[model samples]
Target: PDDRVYIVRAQRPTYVHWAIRKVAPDGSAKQISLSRSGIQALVALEPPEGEPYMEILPSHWTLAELQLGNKWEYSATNNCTHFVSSITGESLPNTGFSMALGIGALTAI
Candidate 1:
């Protein structure tokens, strides 16, 4: 799976989020989406930081898993941990940061 997923942080002390860029059949375009309060919206989905931003191991889950009627919430089932858990089946620890550039945890790989 060459599909790469990146978790981006925006808004200090607010939750960080993740998105994916799925390759098309013709390899001419990519599908990018983000899950938030209301509906799944199309997005430019650029890295909040420059290249070599942090990365977790790619999930066993696929892109379609993200659009499975999930919504985003502050501290409930729709939060980032909840989102990633649905995909990977393991809940990861949470973080608070404005963006990748502001967090020391963000790595260049």
Candidate 2:
């Protein structure tokens, strides 16, 4: 596939259990958490304010279902570093400052 640009719209921390669906009236919805690295759950055009000539990836993620009041760490992934929040995937100096990935449990790259 040709190189395309995307932006992180939301994030669900891996290893943390989250409700995914509802079964019975008395029963609770399903819950899921990433045991390992998995597909990104949220993304859209890198720039939320732009009309880039491309398709809008499904905001729906493959992970657990989102719970109301749950806050997801918004981020971005350009051509370089990937994290919770980033601007212009192009290297720094092009647009030096970017949203930090913020603090999180480290994993082997």
Candidate 3:
């Protein structure tokens, strides 16, 4: 229980990139080496970096489990929050990001 965890993403890049932010109780914050992936769930979301940022979820996370594989990165479609049952590998909700980029296409035989 030393450092607090936060989720941050790049605001300037052509592509939205996200990362894990860590803060001390004294009130200083910085980025750690991690990034999120929606492929399955929050997959150690990484960075695009620099040019001032918006705290998507202020003080969003403070738990250890979220640091683990269970936590998926933040993105538009998945502006959603967290979990369900232990059996379910991961769980999430819906927001504007979901529909905005929700277009899906696939081909399989």
Each model's number of backbone clashes? 0, 5, 13
Give the winner by TM-score: 1
Report every candidate's CA lDDT. Answer: 0.38, 0.24, 0.36
TM-score between candidate 3 and the true structure: 0.33
Q: Determine the backbone clash count of candidate 1.
A: 0
Q: Model 3, range 1-109, lDDT digits (tens) per residue?
A: 5665544434322233334466668866654322334334443423223333333333344332355555444355443222211212233233213333331110010
TM-score of each: 0.37, 0.18, 0.33
Candidate rank order under TM-score: 1, 3, 2
TM-score of model 1 vs. true structure? 0.37
Error of 3 at 95 (Å): 12
Model 2's alpha-carbon lDDT is 0.24
Ranking by lDDT: 1, 3, 2
Off by over 4 Å in 1: 1-13, 20-74, 96-109
lDDT of 2 at 81: 27
Across 1-109, the per-residue lDDT of candidate 1 in tens digits comes to: 6555443334333445543333334543232223332333222233333122234445423543445443333343334444445554554565432243332322222
Give the range where candidate 3 is weakest over 10 consecutive residues by summed lDDT.
100-109
Number of the top candidate by lDDT? Answer: 1
Candidate 2 per-residue C-alpha lDDT over 1-109 given as tens digits, one digit per residue, 9 for 90 to 100: 2222332222224321111221224432222221112223332212122122222122222212232223334223221123211322222222211344222321211
Once superposed on the true structure, which residue ranges of model 3 sit more than 4 Å away at CA?
A: 1-7, 11-13, 23-41, 45-48, 51-61, 64-67, 71-76, 79-109
